[PDB]
Paper text:
Whereas ORF2, ORF3 and ORF4 each encode single proteins, ORF1 codes for a large polyprotein (∼190 kDa) that is processed by the virally-encoded protease at five specific sites to release the six ‘mature’ non-structural proteins (NS1/2–[name])—and an array of functional precursors—that are required for virus replication. The viral [name] present within the C-terminal half of the polyprotein performs all the processing, including its own autocatalytic release from the precursor. Norovirus [name] is a cysteine protease with a chymotrypsin-like fold: two β-barrel domains separated by a cleft that contains a Cys-His-Asp/Glu catalytic triad similar in arrangement to the Ser-His-Asp triad characteristic of serine proteases. To this end we extended an inactive MNV [name] construct (which incorporates a [name] mutation to knock out the active site nucleophile) by adding residues from [name], which is immediately downstream in the polyprotein.
MNV [name] 4′ crystallised in space group C2 but in a unit cell that is very different from the C2 crystals obtained with MNV [name] 1′ and that has only one molecule in the asymmetric unit. Although the extended C-terminus of [name] once again reaches between loops bII-cII and eII-fII of its near neighbour, the relation between the two molecules does not involve two-fold or quasi two-fold symmetry. However, no specific contacts are made by the C-terminal peptide with the substrate binding site.
Author numbering: 4 to 124, 133 to 161, 164 to 179
The structure:
Amino acid sequence: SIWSRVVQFGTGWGFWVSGHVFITAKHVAPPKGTEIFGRKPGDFTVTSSGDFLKYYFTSAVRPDIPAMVLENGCQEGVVASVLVKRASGEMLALAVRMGSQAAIKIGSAVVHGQTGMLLTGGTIPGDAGCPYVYKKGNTWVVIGVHVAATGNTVIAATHGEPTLEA
């Protein structure tokens, strides 16, 4: 069901956080100016940080879904899931122990994101944009989008202002 929020997008995948909010890896997204989901620029606004790309649509695109919480990464040691879809429609929930912050070259330049360790009981380059999620008690929470793999290590791009200020 949460899997219906994961859809193909550009050269990778993206994730519906809510009916109005779509997130993806910037490096797989269609060019700025492209019509998406039958919507023209103007009907949506685009924000980016590093390899994190976020679309906000004025009118809901997926009215069938509730808003999920979007956090800026998670605590170290948290075991999250990478919701990997393949073009065949296959669904692979990859367990990942979230780690600390690293950088990596992605195309033109260097982005920064939260590393993670793929747990065995991996990813391929067309998996970029798939969501990292975890259950916080009763609530599913999205913490970022898949950017790249390494040798066991994955990187997630993150985004979001924490509710509480210092």
